């Protein structure tokens, strides 16, 4: 029973729940994760800057933000490309310019996107949440390779990524301990709103509609009998025995 | 008991009537649910939303 | 009569409509298992509308289709409603659909003169498989290319001809560019001819009537449809569309595998290759046989006998209700077809092979046995009196 | 499928002049009673199968996966 | 009240996405003319008289 | 014979002024 | 994919074909070896096609 | 061209006028939104 | 007569202007749709004003719509109608 | 199109208005001239649009 | 949609008797003066207007361009 | 490929698509390459 990973638990997510919501605060701080100790290797590319404005910060905060960084731009009318501080309007930046770059700068393994890596893992929460958190020390018996990490939660049990959610690793602007637990719940929150961002408008018309629904239901109930009763108590009479 | 008789002596004599009462029962009913489930939204989840965030103006 | 206009009902303009939606005479004890034609009707109606909403933002191509689907989820207003109705509405179509077999099953509606009808469902089957496969592809995710892959290639399983059939229908040498483009032309075609074909279905459904949970003579006590079995239709339709919205609405991604959530790659593959959820009792008969050909020439005898139960000369009662040992068998029939439907999801190893090669052998010995109760039963008149 | 003749007599009564729901649960319990007695044989042939097998194949991986540990 | 949510919200699907209405204001540069002569210019969808 | 003719005529347009101004909410108009 | 089976070479999960390392078919339904396409070397490492 | 000339033709009608052109328009100008938005009506009316 | 088109003439009825990739800055300098939809377009800009160069096309299709409607007229054929006739051809000759 | 009509103007033949060089609908049925934006000088020579 | 008795009396005669072709070639001549002398005043009345309107507008044209001239 | 049978033979187009140089893919160390042109290229352009 190997090359399947070990099998992760469940925790009580926040925004699990048929009237719950997402963490607004755990968002913010794990996108400063993620932006902090996490965009060296990996990317979005389908999360753009003004998905964030009315989500975890105000538009001034992010046109600032996107202010910070320099992004390539089309032909200058000389003939040239040049580059220009970014606008709410572009998307979070690549670390590799390809991917043959990305392998090579990581011993051939390639760091995958991750806008959707929740849904596309079999139960992603918990699964990105435990694989983060839970590297350990191998088992009795079993080496690993030089250049790889061991971790129970990886298909295989070798892994080629090293562990980086040391203690104190950023800095919140809030005051809270960031231990390594702390760091990967806010860093899954944010994850699993750039998977997700509609479950909240999802989730109200759901409920409103279902409420409405059943309601509809118990009128067509009365209508179906109100027309049926005739026939259903009617008596005939037929001049026959056996 | 007679509340039921008297409401449709009134409002069931003609169709467009009963059409036009139809449809802003409708719109009534539709905005008074659309509040109820909201007020049970904001309810469940307090100090969740987007602007409960202490710090939300003091990245400069 | 005819000399002034009575009604406008019974005139040329709506003389059709009144007689076989308004006035058409049905049995008066049908029950809730005659609602399930009606209600696949609405879910294909559902099924076009949503689709021809979805391809305005659409674009076949290999660079640029799952980035079409992710803009659509995920920066058109209300559009997730959209995908989400599609992707789901699929599903909820398939299962409406083999309740309806499993009841027609049931009450030997098969039976004369009602196999015309038999085979027009057959050939209706046929087409819904066809379109839900080709269009499982278009967003071009790892499930999308790898079944594409696997089972255009299971093709080839013919002889000498075999080859130039599938690099034909491939478009080259590969699953590529051209695939995307064909399926989608293909996918947007197939659904108009299934309305066509859902036509022919009711009018020779029509030309006799319907059966009746009793499976005997009907035409003395018979009342209209409306107003008598739209109400009992209504009364479905809204308990469908509360299960549709439950689906839609608090669990959409249930009722799919992850993988397709990953950009499609020809270089690495997925550990564990599967159909979506609706084709696995198929795909465990073809797996069942270790041949090749055999693969192939296992899935034509499953429709050939399919499409030859109506023609058995038989027994003279048709509601299995009468009939203790049809009832039973029916009842292992449908066990069996679940059972298939989960081994067809397993790794091809023990126990699993045994485990999928029974029940095939079952699933067509159910076909085997029924015409000998026909011929046994023939003589139940002249023994029990 | 037309003109039988038939020769019978019936009455009926308006919609009107009658109880509709209370008809639903008058007797419930003894219903249940009667639908288990009729349909319990078909319970036992659909459900059968299913769990036979299930606990035959969790029995064999069970003690496959005790059998190859070292 | 469901006539008039399914309706609205396929009619409402076919107007301007967020990605449109994300470029819809800026200010850009020319360059110098001749007096009573034009050279056109460029901007997000629109060009300059 | 006129007189509840128009009346219902004019009930009718009254209703479907009701379910345009329900289909569509301008508060602009 | 490889290492995978009861026959040491590679396994193809699309319909349980099991390989040796070799890479002949001994269980299942493929009825032909891995096809081998031409191919050489020129001195030590370079495996021309 | 022609499908900028005759679908701004219908910002002529009174004050529903610019807003259902841009509604048809599908954004600000004839642009992609509009190339595949006629692609499916295309493929769908000749059935009707 | 098809097949004439298709092979031995399958440009002729088609703008030149179809050939160049879409260049939304620059504006040909005759604008026209193709050859079956010339009298709607010449109806249509014969107005020196929008409303009413849009609102014209609606009495053709209300005309075209309203023709079956008058009841006086008994006999069909235009054979035994001269005046009807002539003014059919003088109506084509119009509309070309 | 600059260049065209009675008026050395902008005249467009997509439906035949001819404006003025001011920019003013002389004949045509144009409901509105064509719109000013915002725009001025930062010493001589360049305006932001 | 019906139909009125007649009293009518008709023969006919079998398809392989009679000689097919020769009829279209008879006597063309005397049928095309017969159509033309039948529908000159519908050609007259169809192709009128164009030539009326095409050499007006020559004209004008011509006449504006050469005295546009220098 | 367009003018072998049309203007040249074959080997004549291999050695002329030989002639010019036009860029590749990534390699392995994720750089934009040169080489040699062949019979599946298509006519250069002068201007980026
Ligand atoms: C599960 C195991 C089977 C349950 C059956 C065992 C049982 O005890 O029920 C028999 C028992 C009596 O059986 P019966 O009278 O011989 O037969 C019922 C007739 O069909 C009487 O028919 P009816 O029309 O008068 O009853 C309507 C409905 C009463 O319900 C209503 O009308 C509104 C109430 C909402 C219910 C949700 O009750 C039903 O019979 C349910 C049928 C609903 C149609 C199903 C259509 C399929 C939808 C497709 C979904 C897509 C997949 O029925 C009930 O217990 C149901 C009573 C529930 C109380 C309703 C009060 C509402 C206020
Ligand atoms: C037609 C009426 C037949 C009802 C079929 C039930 C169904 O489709 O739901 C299974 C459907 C299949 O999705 P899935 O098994 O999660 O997908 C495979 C997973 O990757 C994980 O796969 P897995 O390890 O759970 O095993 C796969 C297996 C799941 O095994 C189960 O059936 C679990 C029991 C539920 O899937 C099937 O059994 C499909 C066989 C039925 C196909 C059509 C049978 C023809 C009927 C004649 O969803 C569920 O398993 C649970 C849904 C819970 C609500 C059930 C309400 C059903 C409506
Ligand atoms: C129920 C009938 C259909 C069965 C649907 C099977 C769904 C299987 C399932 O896993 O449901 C889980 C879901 C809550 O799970 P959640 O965390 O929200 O996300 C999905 C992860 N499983 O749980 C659900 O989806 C249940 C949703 C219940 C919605 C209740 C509607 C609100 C109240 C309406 C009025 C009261 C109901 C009257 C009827
Ligand atoms: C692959 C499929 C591609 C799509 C096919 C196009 C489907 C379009 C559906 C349109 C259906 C055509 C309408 C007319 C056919 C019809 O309704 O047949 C009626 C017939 C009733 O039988 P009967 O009453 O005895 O006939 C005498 C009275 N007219 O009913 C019958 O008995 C069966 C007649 C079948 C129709 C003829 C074929
Ligand atoms: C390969 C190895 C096979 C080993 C198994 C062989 C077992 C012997 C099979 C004999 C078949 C007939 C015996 C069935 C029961 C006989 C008793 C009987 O005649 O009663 C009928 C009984 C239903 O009982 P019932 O009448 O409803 O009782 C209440 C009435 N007041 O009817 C029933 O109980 C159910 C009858 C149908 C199910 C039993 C036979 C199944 C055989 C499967 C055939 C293949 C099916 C594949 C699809
Ligand atoms: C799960 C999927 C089920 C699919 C079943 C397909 C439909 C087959 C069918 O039509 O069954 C009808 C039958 C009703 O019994 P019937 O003889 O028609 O009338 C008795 C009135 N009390 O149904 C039955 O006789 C028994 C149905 C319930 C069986 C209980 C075991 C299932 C749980
Ligand atoms: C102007 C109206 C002119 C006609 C006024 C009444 C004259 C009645 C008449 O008989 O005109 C005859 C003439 C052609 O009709 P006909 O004499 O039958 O010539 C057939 C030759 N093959 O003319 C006609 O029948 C058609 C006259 C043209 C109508 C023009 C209306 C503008
Ligand atoms: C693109 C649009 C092109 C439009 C083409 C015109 C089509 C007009 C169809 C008119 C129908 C027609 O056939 O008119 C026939 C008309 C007289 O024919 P009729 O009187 O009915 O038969 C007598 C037999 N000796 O025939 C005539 O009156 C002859 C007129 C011919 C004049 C042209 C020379
Ligand atoms: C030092 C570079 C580096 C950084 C920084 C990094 N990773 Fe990784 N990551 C990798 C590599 C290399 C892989 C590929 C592992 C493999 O293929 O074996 C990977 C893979 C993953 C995977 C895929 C696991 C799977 O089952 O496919 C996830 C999820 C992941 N990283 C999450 C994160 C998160 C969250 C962070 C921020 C805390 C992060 N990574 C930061 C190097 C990095
Ligand atoms: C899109 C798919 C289908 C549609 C829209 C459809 C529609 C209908 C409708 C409306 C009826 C009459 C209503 C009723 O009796 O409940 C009916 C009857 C019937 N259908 Fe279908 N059906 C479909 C698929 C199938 C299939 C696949 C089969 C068989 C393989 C089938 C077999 C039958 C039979 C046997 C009847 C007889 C009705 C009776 O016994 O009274 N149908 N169908
Ligand atoms: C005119 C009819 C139809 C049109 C225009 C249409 C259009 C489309 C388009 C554009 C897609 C790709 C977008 C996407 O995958 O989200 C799609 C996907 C799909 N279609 Fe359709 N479709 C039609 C009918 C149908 C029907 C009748 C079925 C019946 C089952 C069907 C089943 C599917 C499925 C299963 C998918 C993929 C589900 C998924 O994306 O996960 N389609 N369709």
Redesign the interface.
Same mark, same amino acid.
């Given at each position: 029973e190997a090359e399947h990973g070990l099998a992760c638990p469940s925790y009580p997510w926040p925004h699990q729940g048929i009237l719950s919501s997402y963490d607004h605060a755990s968002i913010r701080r794990g996108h400063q994760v993620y932006t902090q100790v996490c965009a060296s290797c990996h990317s979005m590319s389908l999360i753009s800057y003004r998905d964030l404005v009315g989500v975890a910060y105000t538009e001034e905060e992010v046109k600032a933000m996107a202010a910070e960084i320099e992004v390539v731009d089309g032909p200058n009318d000389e003939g040239e490309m040049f580059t220009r501080p970014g606008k709410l309007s572009d998307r979070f930046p690549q670390p590799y310019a390809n991917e043959a770059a990305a392998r090579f700068a990581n011993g051939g393994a390639y760091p995958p996107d991750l806008s959707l890596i929740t849904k596309a893992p079999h139960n992603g929460q918990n699964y990105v949440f435990a694989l983060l958190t839970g590297y350990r020390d191998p088992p009795a018996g079993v080496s690993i390779r030089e250049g790889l990490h061991y971790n129970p939660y990886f298909p295989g049990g070798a892994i080629a990524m090293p562990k980086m959610l040391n203690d104190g690793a950023v800095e919140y602007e809030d005051g809270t301990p960031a231990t390594e637990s702390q760091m990967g719940k806010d860093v899954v929150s944010f994850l699993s709103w750039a998977a997700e961002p509609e479950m909240e408008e999802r989730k109200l018309m759901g409920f409103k509609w279902i409420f409405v629904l059943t309601l509809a239901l118990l009128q067509a109930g009365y209508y179906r009998r109100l027309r049926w009763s005739v026939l259903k108590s009617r008596k005939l009479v037929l001049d026959v025995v056996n | 008991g007679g509340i039921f008789e008297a409401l449709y002596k009134v409002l069931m004599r003609?169709n467009? @009537?009963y @059409?036009?009462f139809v449809?802003?029962g409708?719109?009534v009913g539709e905005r008074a649910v659309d509040y109820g489930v909201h007020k049970l939204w904001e309810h469940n989840n307090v100090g969740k939303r987007y602007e409960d965030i202490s710090v939300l103006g003091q990245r400069q | 009569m005819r000399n002034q206009r009575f009604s406008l009902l019974k005139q040329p303009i709506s003389s059709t409509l009144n007689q076989h939606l308004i006035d058409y005479p049905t049995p008066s004890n049908l029950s809730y298992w005659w609602g399930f034609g009606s209600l696949a009707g609405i879910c294909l109606v559902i099924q076009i509308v949503t689709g021809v909403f979805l391809a305005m933002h659409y674009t076949p191509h290999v660079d640029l289709a799952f980035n079409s689907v992710e803009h659509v989820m995920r920066d058109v207003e209300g559009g997730w409603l959209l995908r989400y109705m599609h992707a789901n509405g699929a599903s909820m179509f398939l299962i409406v659909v083999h309740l309806h077999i499993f009841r027609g099953l049931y009450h030997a509606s098969y039976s004369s003169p009602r196999e015309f009808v038999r085979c027009l469902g057959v050939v209706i089957f046929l087409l819904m498989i066809v379109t839900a496969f080709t269009g499982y592809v278009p967003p071009w995710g790892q499930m999308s290319f790898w079944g594409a892959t696997v089972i255009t290639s299971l093709a080839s399983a013919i002889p000498v001809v075999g080859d130039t059939i599938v690099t034909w229908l491939w478009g080259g040498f590969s699953v590529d560019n051209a695939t995307l483009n064909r399926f989608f032309s293909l996918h947007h075609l197939l659904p108009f001819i299934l309305v066509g074909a859902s036509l022919l279905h009711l009018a020779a459904l029509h030309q006799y009537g319907s059966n009746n949970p009793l499976g005997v003579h009907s035409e003395m006590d018979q009342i209209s449809f409306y107003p008598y079995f739209y109400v009992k239709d209504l009364v479905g339709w809204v308990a469908f569309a509360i299960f549709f919205s439950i689906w839609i609405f608090y669990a959409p991604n249930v009722l799919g595998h992850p993988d397709n959530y990953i950009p499609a790659n020809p270089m690495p593959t997925p550990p564990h290759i599967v159909p979506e959820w609706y084709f696995l009792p198929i795909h465990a008969i073809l797996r069942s046989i270790p041949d090749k050909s055999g693969g192939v020439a296992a899935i034509a005898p499953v429709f050939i006998c399919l499409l030859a139960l109506p023609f058995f000369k038989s027994m003279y009662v048709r509601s299995s209700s009468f009939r203790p040992i049809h009832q039973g068998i029916f009842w292992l029939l449908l066990a069996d077809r679940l059972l298939l439907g989960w081994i067809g999801c397993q790794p091809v190893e023990a126990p699993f092979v045994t485990i999928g090669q029974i029940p095939p052998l079952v699933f067509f010995l159910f076909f085997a046995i029924t015409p000998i109760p026909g011929r046994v039963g023939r003589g139940i008149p002249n023994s029990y009196t | 499928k037309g003109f039988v003749p038939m020769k019978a007599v019936t009455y009926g009564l308006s919609p009107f002049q009658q109880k509709i729901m209370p008809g639903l649960w008058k007797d419930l319990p003894t219903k249940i009673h009667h639908k288990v007695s009729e349909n319990w044989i078909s319970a036992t042939l659909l459900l059968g199968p299913l769990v036979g097998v299930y606990s035959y194949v969790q029995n064999y991986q069970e003690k496959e996966k005790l059998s190859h540990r070292y | 009240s469901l006539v008039?949510l399914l309706?609205?919200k396929f009619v409402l699907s076919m107007s301007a996405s967020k990605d449109v209405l994300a470029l819809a204001s800026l200010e850009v540069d020319l360059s110098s003319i001749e007096p009573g002569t034009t050279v056109t210019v460029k901007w997000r969808g629109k060009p300059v008289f | 014979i006129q007189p509840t003719d128009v009346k219902?005529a004019a009930?009718?347009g009254?209703?479907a002024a009701?379910?345009g101004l329900?289909?569509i909410q301008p508060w602009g108009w | 994919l490889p290492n995978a089976g009861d026959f040491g070479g590679w396994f193809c999960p699309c319909h349980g074909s099991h390989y040796d390392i070799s890479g002949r078919i001994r269980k299942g339904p493929a009825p032909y070896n891995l096809e081998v396409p031409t191919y050489t070397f020129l001195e030590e490492n370079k495996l021309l096609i």
């Open positions: - | 003609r467009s @009537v @059409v036009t449809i802003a409708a719109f | - | - | 008039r309706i609205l | 219902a009930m009718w009254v209703a009701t379910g329900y289909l | -």
